[PDB]
Amino acid sequence: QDSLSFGFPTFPSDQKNLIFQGDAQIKNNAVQLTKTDSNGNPVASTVGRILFSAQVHLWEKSSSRVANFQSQFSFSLKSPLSNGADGIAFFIAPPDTTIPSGSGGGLLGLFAPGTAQNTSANQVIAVEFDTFYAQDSNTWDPNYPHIGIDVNSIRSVKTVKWDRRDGQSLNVLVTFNPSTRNLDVVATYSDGTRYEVSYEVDVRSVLPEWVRVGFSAASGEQYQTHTLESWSFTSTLLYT
Amino acid sequence: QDSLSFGFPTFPSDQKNLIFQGDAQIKNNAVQLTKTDSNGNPVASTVGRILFSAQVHLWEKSSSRVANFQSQFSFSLKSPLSNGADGIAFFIAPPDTTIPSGSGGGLLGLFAPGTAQNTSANQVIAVEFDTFYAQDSNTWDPNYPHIGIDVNSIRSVKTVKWDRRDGQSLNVLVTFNPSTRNLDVVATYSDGTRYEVSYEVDVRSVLPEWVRVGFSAASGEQYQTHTLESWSFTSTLLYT
Numbered sequence: 074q075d076s077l078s079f080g081f082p083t084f085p086s087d088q089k090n091l092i093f094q095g096d097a098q099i100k101n102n103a104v105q106l107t108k109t110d111s112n113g114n115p116v117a118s119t120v121g122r123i124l125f126s127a128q129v130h131l132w133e134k135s136s137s138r139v140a141n142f143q144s145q146f147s148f149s150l151k152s153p154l155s156n157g158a159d160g161i162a163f164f165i166a167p168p169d170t171t172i173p174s175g176s177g178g179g180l181l182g183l184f185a186p187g188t189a190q191n192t193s194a195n196q197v198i199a200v201e202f203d204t205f206y207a208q209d210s211n212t213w214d215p216n217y218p219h220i221g222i223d224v225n226s227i228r229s230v231k232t233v234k235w236d237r238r239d240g241q242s243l244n245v246l247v248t249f250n251p252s253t254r255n256l257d258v259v260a261t262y263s264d265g266t267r268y269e270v271s272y273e274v275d276v277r278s279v280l281p282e283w284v285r286v287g288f289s290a291a292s293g294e295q296y297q298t299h300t301l302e303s304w305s306f307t308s309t310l311l312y313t
Numbered sequence: 314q315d316s317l318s319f320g321f322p323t324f325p326s327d328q329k330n331l332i333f334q335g336d337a338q339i340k341n342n343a344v345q346l347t348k349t350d351s352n353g354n355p356v357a358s359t360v361g362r363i364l365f366s367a368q369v370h371l372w373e374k375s376s377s378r379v380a381n382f383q384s385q386f387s388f389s390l391k392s393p394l395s396n397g398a399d400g401i402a403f404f405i406a407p408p409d410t411t412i413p414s415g416s417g418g419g420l421l422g423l424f425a426p427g428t429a430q431n432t433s434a435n436q437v438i439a440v441e442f443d444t445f446y447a448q449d450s451n452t453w454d455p456n457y458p459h460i461g462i463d464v465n466s467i468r469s470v471k472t473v474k475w476d477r478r479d480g481q482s483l484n485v486l487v488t489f490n491p492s493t494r495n496l497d498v499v500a501t502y503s504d505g506t507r508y509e510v511s512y513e514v515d516v517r518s519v520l521p522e523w524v525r526v527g528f529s530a531a532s533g534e535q536y537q538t539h540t541l542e543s544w545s546f547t548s549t550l551l552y553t
């Protein structure tokens with residue numbers, strides 16, 4: 074289809090169109106990307122992702138068209154630790170994408186250690202909300218929590234300072250306009266605090282015509298819950 | 314998802330979210346539900362169906378919600394004969410639906426012979442565009458071409474006299490309103506000729522909570538092409 078849209082105001086346990094990978098599962102009408110114990114507390118060494126089952130037609134060679142898409146979602150992070158890790162990311166990748174071996178912790182379940190910073194070995198666009206930036210282990214990160222745009226590498230093409238707020242939901246709107254090729258990110262907390270970051274990228278040179286969209290999160294030695302609370306997505310092919 | 318929508322203005326060969334069953338295949342940017350030869354002419358004894366891959370949440374027992382839905386599509390029928398058969402149908406059924414054994418010809422690839430008129434043995438709602446009504450083989454049909462609403466039986470609960478026009482595209486709008494429980498069908502030819510038929514039905518007592526939507530067509534001894542040209546669908550769970 075040239076156009077596709079779906080909306081999850083909440084996430085009931087009875088799901089049919091979500092692909093669950095790793096430890097991801099539904100609990101209390103939300104998606105818990107990372108594993109939690111019986112008490113609902115976060116644990117270390119966990120990775121989880123979800124993808125919508127239907128494939129999205131991002132661009133089309135034959136017609137020279139590229140999709141205009143928007144993804145709106147909200148999530149919250151919670152941890153008793155002073156340095157909860159590692160973060161959650163909205164991502165777009167080839168349909169057959171699976172969790173790479175050793176992609177835990179700072180690699181957010183998106184990259185393999187051997188090629189995490191090799192842009193020629195990956196096919197992924199992701200918007201990360203990264204809460205762990207220890208310069209000794211996450212050497213590629215700026216020294217502070219941040220929102221980053223990742224294009225084929227865990228080393229973001231761009232980041233902006235972000236404030237992690239325990240237990241508070243962050244609403245995010247990610248849009249891509251094929252005419253300007255701008256990928257825009259706008260995130261806000263309920264008190265009006267806003268973060269904005271944009272990057273110009275030709276998705277046709279990074280991803281295949283058909284892709285899947287979803288979320289990924291991980292926790293290494295430090296941990297926190299990564300709770301996806303709602304998600305709506307729409308995409309339509311436009312001539313450009 | 315509480316809401317889902319998709320649109321196929323045309324049907325390029327590169328399809329990823331369609332389930333093809335029987336003889337259905339893409340040719341010339343359209344879906345040919347029934348088999349055709351090299352010259353492109355229709356052949357006898359063929360059945361074909363397509364279903365969208367993502368499951369639709371038609372109703373939710375826990376929240377007591379039922380979805381409204383709208384399906385818009387266009388198709389054309391062509392045949393060297395004047396008695397083209399058998400017809401095409403838009404249908405909604407359980408996700409694991411497959412072509413029943415011996416469902417060719419007048420059964421439109423939707424029902425099994427032994428239970429075609431047994432409402433207690435079926436789970437399907439369909440809107441048929443029936444062009445063949447010979448009483449020797451299609452005993453359940455009115456004696457004229459027609460559009461009908463089928464609820465668990467090949468014998469339509471409601472029909473309207475219809476005119477088959479070789480090679481002309483028929484635009485159809487099918488809508489279900491959970492508030493009134495009315496399934497409405499409006500079909501029009503380009504010159505404005507219009508046909509309408511509606512029926513009140515509680516989808517909750519006929520189908521499971523999750524379903525798949527698609528089209529089916531068949532040709533027995535008499536034949537014609539059943540070309541699906543475009544298709545858009547939208548569904549949203551409502552409280553009412």
Ligand SMILES: OC[C@H]1O[C@H](O[C@@H]2[C@H](O)[C@@H](O)O[C@H](CO)[C@H]2O)[C@@H](O)[C@@H](O)[C@@H]1O
Nearest residue numbers: 398399418419445447450532533534535
């Ligand atoms: O495709 C039309 C029709 O074909 C087959 O039935 C035949 C027709 O009723 C007509 O041609 O007369 C034949 C002789 O009695 C009869 O077989 C079946 O496949 C039927 O299901 C289909 O509708």
Ligand SMILES: [Ca+2]
Nearest residue numbers: 179203205211
């Ligand atoms: Ca990090």
Ligand SMILES: [Ca+2]
Nearest residue numbers: 419443445451
């Ligand atoms: Ca018939």
Ligand SMILES: [Mn+2]
Nearest residue numbers: 203214221229
């Ligand atoms: Mn980072």
Ligand SMILES: [Mn+2]
Nearest residue numbers: 443454461469
């Ligand atoms: Mn009929």
